[PDB]
Structures are given as C-alpha cells and as structure tokens.
C-alpha cells in the first residue's frame, strides 16, 4: 500500500500539473490568435493606404 | 492497493491525455506565432513603403 499510494500521489500531481499547463496553453492560443487577427487587419489597412 | 492501482490507472490515463493536449496546444502556439511573425514583417515592410 505504501508504494501504491506513492504512485497515486505522483500520478495525481502529474495530471493536475498537466491540466494547468493545458489551460495556460489554451489561453495563450486565444491571446496569440487575437494578436494575429489585429496584425492582419493592420496589414490590410496599410496595404490599402500604400496603393 | 486495488483502489490505489485503479486510481493510478485513471490518473495516468488523464495525465497522458493532458500531455497530448499540451503537445497539440504548443504546436498551435508555435504555428500561430510564426503567422504573427510573418504578419508583423509585412507590417514593417508596409511602413517602409509608407515612408
């Protein structure tokens, strides 16, 4: 039981940390997508003014 | 020990799933980052053309 509970603890800690990493990466994805959209809009406006 | 082993299996499956999510989300992060880099390079070229 000592080994089994230690394995349980390590697996649970790893899964929780992985979930936190997943949430952080997803919010990073949405942030970077917003920045990309703003950059594309700026590019379009700049090209029109250039022409 | 039986319950501990079952929870170990569940936790390791969930952690592997979240690790795959991490891999996918980091791939998306890098790809959108590259697209944003291209967009900002285009923006810099556009400002140069404005000048």
């Amino acid at each position: 039981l000592k080994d089994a509970q230690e394995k349980l603890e390590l697996a649970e800690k790893k899964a929780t940390d992985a979930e936190a990493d997943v949430a952080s990466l997803n919010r990073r994805i949405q942030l970077v997508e917003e920045e990309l959209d703003r950059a594309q809009e700026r590019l379009a406006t700049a090209l029109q003014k250039l022409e």
Side-chain angles (χ1 to χ4, degrees), chain A residues 2-4 7 12 21 31 36-37 40 45-46 49-50:
Chain A
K2 179 177 179 299
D3 165 72
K7 293 180 305 183
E12 179 178 1
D21 207 4
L31 193 64
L36 162 145
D37 132 82
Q40 293 169 339
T45 58
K49 278 173 284 297
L50 157 65

Side-chain angles (χ1 to χ4, degrees), chain A residues 6-34:
Chain A
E6 182 182 354
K7 293 180 305 183
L8 159 138
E9 160 267 0
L10 61 88
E12 179 178 1
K13 242 55 69 267
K14 155 181 46 57
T16 50
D17 285 51
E19 171 185 357
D21 207 4
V22 169
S24 303
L25 260 63
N26 185 274
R27 72 144 293 97
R28 221 61 39 81
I29 283 180
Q30 52 82 18
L31 193 64
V32 180
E33 171 57 34
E34 158 268 328

